[PDB]
Amino acid sequence: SIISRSTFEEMLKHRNDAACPAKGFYTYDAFISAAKAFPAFGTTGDVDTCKREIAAFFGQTSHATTGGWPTAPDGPYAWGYCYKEELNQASSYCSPSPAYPCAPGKKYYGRGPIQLSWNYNYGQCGQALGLDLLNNPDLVATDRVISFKAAIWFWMTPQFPKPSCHDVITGQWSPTGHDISAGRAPGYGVITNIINGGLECGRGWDARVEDRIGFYKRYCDMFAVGYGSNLDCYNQTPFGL
């Protein structure tokens, strides 16, 4: 009960349009089942903080899967969850390691709501959930429940030097001096940085960053809560340089 059926359907009300390749795949019942694997997701903090965690998770995943455009019906921030796999599937996304070795003939391109990528992410996730995602990465795009479990797993897991998205949005992250001079003050912008900052943050205005913010504001307005501070990353140095 971290979110109701009718709220879920209104948030994602164009995902089953004829133009959307993932039509029929994303369901309320499968999201609720995946959430049970991570009981602290959506239940941490006061009432306003729980609402902001739900709006931020669906804001970032909506951008990663959007089919919107500026004159779309009900505006561009009603078109999340239209896709479920990366458009260009040429690359294998292999970064060789003894810990998580790349399986022969397999490819670790983006799948599901968070567009999970690279062998080390499929590997760590599969270990945590007791699933064989390193040998069978397609499961993140073919099984309705596992697709959501992989996205929530990423949201909840720190990867040094990055904190978890969960910790940042619930107020459990405390920035160091190094973070402060890089412009990384706590808020929605730092979450964009964790997810894809190497390509999107610190260079000035960027259309992808604006689109992430638009979805988050719409969902916050639906729940009647304020946005918080520091929403963009136009002036933040990326993690890991």
Q: Choose between 53 and 200: whose C-beta lies nearer to Cl ion.
A: 53
Contacts with 213 (C-beta within 8 Å, 6 or more apart), sequence order: 59, 188, 231, 232
Q: Choose between 102 and 152: whose C-beta lies nearer to Cl ion.
A: 152
Is residue 158 reached through a cis peptide bond, with omega within 30 degrees of 0 on the bond before it? no
Supply the minimum distance, in Å, between the C-beta of residue 39 and Cl ion: 5
* Residue with tokens 């963009």, as numbered in its chain: 232
Of 30-38, 91-99, 194-202, 228-236, the segment contacting Cl ion by CB under 5 A is 30-38
> Which one of residues 40, 180, 185, 222 is an interface residue with Cl ion (CB under 5 A)?
40
> Which one of residues 38, 173, 223, 227 is an interface residue with Cl ion (CB under 5 A)?
38
Supply the minimum distance, in Å, between the C-beta of residue 165 and Cl ion: 13
Size of the site for Cl ion (CB under 5 A): 2
Q: Choose between 83 and 155: whose C-beta lies nearer to Cl ion.
A: 155
Supply the minimum distance, in Å, between the C-beta of residue 185 and Cl ion: 26
Of 36-44, 60-68, 77-85, 186-194, the segment contacting Cl ion by CB under 5 A is 36-44
Q: How far apart are CA 31 and CA 41, in angstroms?
A: 12
DSSP string, 111-163: BTTTTB-SHHHHHHHHHHHT--TTT-TTHHHH-HHHHHHHHHHHHH--BTTBP
Q: Choose between 114 and 141: whose C-beta lies nearer to Cl ion.
A: 114
Which stretches of the chain are DSSP H helices? 5-11, 28-35, 47-64, 119-129, 139-142, 144-156, 165-170, 177-181, 188-200, 207-223
Of 12-20, 39-47, 181-189, 206-214, the segment contacting Cl ion by CB under 5 A is 39-47
Strand partners, 159: 162
- The answer to whether residues 193 and 238 touch, using CB atoms and an 8 Å cutoff, is yes
Of 37-45, 58-66, 129-137, 142-150, the segment contacting Cl ion by CB under 5 A is 37-45
Strand partners, 111: 85, 116
Of 31-39, 55-63, 103-111, 231-239, the segment contacting Cl ion by CB under 5 A is 31-39
Q: Choose between 79 and 155: whose C-beta lies nearer to Cl ion.
A: 155
The residues that touch Cl ion, with contacts defined as CB under 5 A, are 38, 40
